[PDB]
Amino acid sequence: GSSGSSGSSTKSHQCHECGRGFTLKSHLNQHQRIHTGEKPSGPSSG
Per CB under 5 A, 29 contacts Zn ion: no
Contact window for Zn ion (CB under 5 A) among 1-9, 11-19, 36-44: 11-19
Q: Report the distance separating Cα 27 and Cα 7, nearest Å.
A: 22
Are the beta carbons of 13 and 21 closer than 8 angstroms? Answer: yes
Contact window for Zn ion (CB under 5 A) among 4-12, 14-22, 37-45: 14-22
Among 2, 3, 10, 17, binds Zn ion (CB under 5 A): 17
How is residue 24 annotated by DSSP?
S
Gyration radius of the chain over CA positions: 15
Per CB under 5 A, 24 contacts Zn ion: no
